Design a protein around this motif. Structure first.
Motif, PDB file in Angstrom:
ATOM      1  N   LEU A 146       0.880  -1.272   0.106  1.00 52.87           N
ATOM      2  CA  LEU A 146      -0.147   0.050  -0.056  1.00 52.87           C
ATOM      3  C   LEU A 146       0.983   1.035  -0.071  1.00 52.87           C
ATOM      4  O   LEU A 146       1.919   1.178   0.607  1.00 52.87           O
ATOM      5  N   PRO A 147       0.621   2.305  -0.790  1.00 52.33           N
ATOM      6  CA  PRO A 147       1.201   3.576  -0.604  1.00 52.33           C
ATOM      7  C   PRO A 147       1.266   4.064   0.962  1.00 52.33           C
ATOM      8  O   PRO A 147       0.251   3.898   1.709  1.00 52.33           O
ATOM      9  N   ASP A 148       2.270   4.690   1.249  1.00 58.14           N
ATOM     10  CA  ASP A 148       2.665   5.153   2.554  1.00 58.14           C
ATOM     11  C   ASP A 148       1.713   6.096   3.102  1.00 58.14           C
ATOM     12  O   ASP A 148       1.002   6.211   4.123  1.00 58.14           O
ATOM     13  N   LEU A 149       1.044   6.831   1.985  1.00 53.44           N
ATOM     14  CA  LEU A 149       0.154   7.780   2.274  1.00 53.44           C
ATOM     15  C   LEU A 149      -1.230   7.377   2.911  1.00 53.44           C
ATOM     16  O   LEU A 149      -1.864   7.999   3.652  1.00 53.44           O
ATOM     17  N   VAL A 150      -1.629   5.966   2.577  1.00 50.50           N
ATOM     18  CA  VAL A 150      -2.984   5.537   2.948  1.00 50.50           C
ATOM     19  C   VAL A 150      -3.044   4.363   3.870  1.00 50.50           C
ATOM     20  O   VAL A 150      -3.988   4.043   4.482  1.00 50.50           O
TER      21      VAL A 150
END
Ligand SMILES: [Cl-]
Ligand code: NA
Ligand code: NA
Ligand code: NA
Ligand code: NA
Ligand code: NA
Ligand code: NA
Ligand code: NA
Ligand code: NA
Ligand code: NA
Ligand code: NA
Ligand code: NA
Ligand code: NA
Ligand code: NA
Ligand code: NA
Lengths: 285, 11
Positions: free
Chosen positions: B3-7
């Motif tokens: 998963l992207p770090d953002l989310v």
């Protein structure tokens, strides 16, 4: 008169392809055409009156595609050359007629690479890489320099800052922020670089600070009403606006407008849709 | 991958 576009993002397990437009004169948000792709961690800016959406992540995959929007036709076009690698949580800004893509992650690594798009050639070209790998970096352009602020190197959020001289094709490290911030918003306002929100090591942030290149100093700015990681920040008709994000519990559709005279941020109901890690762009109509 | 770090969640 300027209008602001909020593009893409993430909410409750899904990336977002929808796009909406804020009209300051009426304080209304209206849906416009959706992108071809869902994109969270998308880099957004405006170049020659076209709104660009660079990279991001569609919920399944990291992306290297780029699309652009013409407000006059209300159409997105997938007619832009792709970047050399995937670019997610990438900072995008315009300087000297080029669109720069700074940092991000490609799915395997945090990036220090930087490339710029020449709209006349429909071509991306690598320029000097940053000193530091920065996913979730924010960028701003002031005094002919491109600033890269914060981000994460894959291990920790960063308080460090560097700026790019396009004449030299070199990056230089300048004064650091008081707080480590990844997934923050940055924008030039009143000839200083404002940095708001993001996450530090332990929490989503409501704090803010501003950088004066004359003094090479960062100073604290009054905190926002809400904590906001993955927040957008832009100036529309001379007003500094923070858009969306995530507060630790809730995906946000609210926006806040900075009032420098009152020294406070004013919270408004905001967008049609909640958006963590979308992008914002400002078009002069 | 990932998963992207953002989310990705923190809890
Ligand atoms: Cl509205
Ligand atoms: Na959507
Ligand atoms: Na998609
Ligand atoms: Na992928
Ligand atoms: Na794609
Ligand atoms: Na690094
Ligand atoms: Na981190
Ligand atoms: Na310099
Ligand atoms: Na910190
Ligand atoms: Na430490
Ligand atoms: Na500070
Ligand atoms: Na929510
Ligand atoms: Na929503
Ligand atoms: Na813009
Ligand atoms: Na990310």
């Amino acid at each position: 008169g300027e209008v602001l576009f909020a593009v893409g993002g993430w909410c409750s397990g899904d990336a977002i392809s929808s796009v909406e437009r804020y009209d300051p004169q009426t304080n209304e948000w209206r849906m416009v055409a959706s992108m071809s792709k869902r994109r969270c961690g998308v880099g957004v800016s405006v170049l020659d009156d076209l709104l660009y959406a660079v990279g991001g992540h569609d919920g399944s995959s990291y992306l290297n595609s780029v699309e652009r929007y013409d407000p006059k036709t209300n159409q997105w076009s997938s007619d832009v050359a792709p970047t050399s690698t995937c670019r997610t949580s990438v900072g995008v800004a315009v300087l000297g007629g080029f669109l720069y893509a700074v940092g991000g992650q490609d799915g395997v690594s945090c990036l220090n690479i930087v490339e710029r798009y020449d709209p006349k050639e429909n071509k991306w070209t690598r320029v000097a890489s940053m000193s530091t790998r920065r996913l979730g970096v924010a960028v701003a352009v002031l005094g002919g320099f491109l600033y890269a602020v914060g981000g994460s190197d894959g291990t920790s959020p960063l308080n460090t800052v560097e700026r790019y001289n396009p004449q030299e094709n070199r990056w230089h490290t300048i004064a650091p922020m008081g707080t480590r911030r990844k997934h923050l918003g940055c924008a030039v306002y009143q000839d200083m670089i404002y940095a708001v929100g993001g996450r530090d090591d332990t929490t989503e942030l409501s704090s803010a600070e501003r950088y004066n290149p004359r003094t090479n100093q960062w100073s604290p700015v009054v905190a926002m009403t809400s904590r906001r990681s993955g927040v957008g920040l832009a100036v529309v008709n001379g007003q500094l606006m923070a858009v969306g994000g995530f507060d630790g519990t809730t995906y946000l559709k609210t926006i806040e407008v900075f009032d420098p005279d009152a020294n406070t941020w004013r919270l408004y109901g905001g967008m049609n849709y909640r958006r963590l890690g979308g992008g914002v762009g400002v078009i002069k109509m | 991958l990932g998963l992207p770090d953002l989310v990705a969640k923190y809890n």
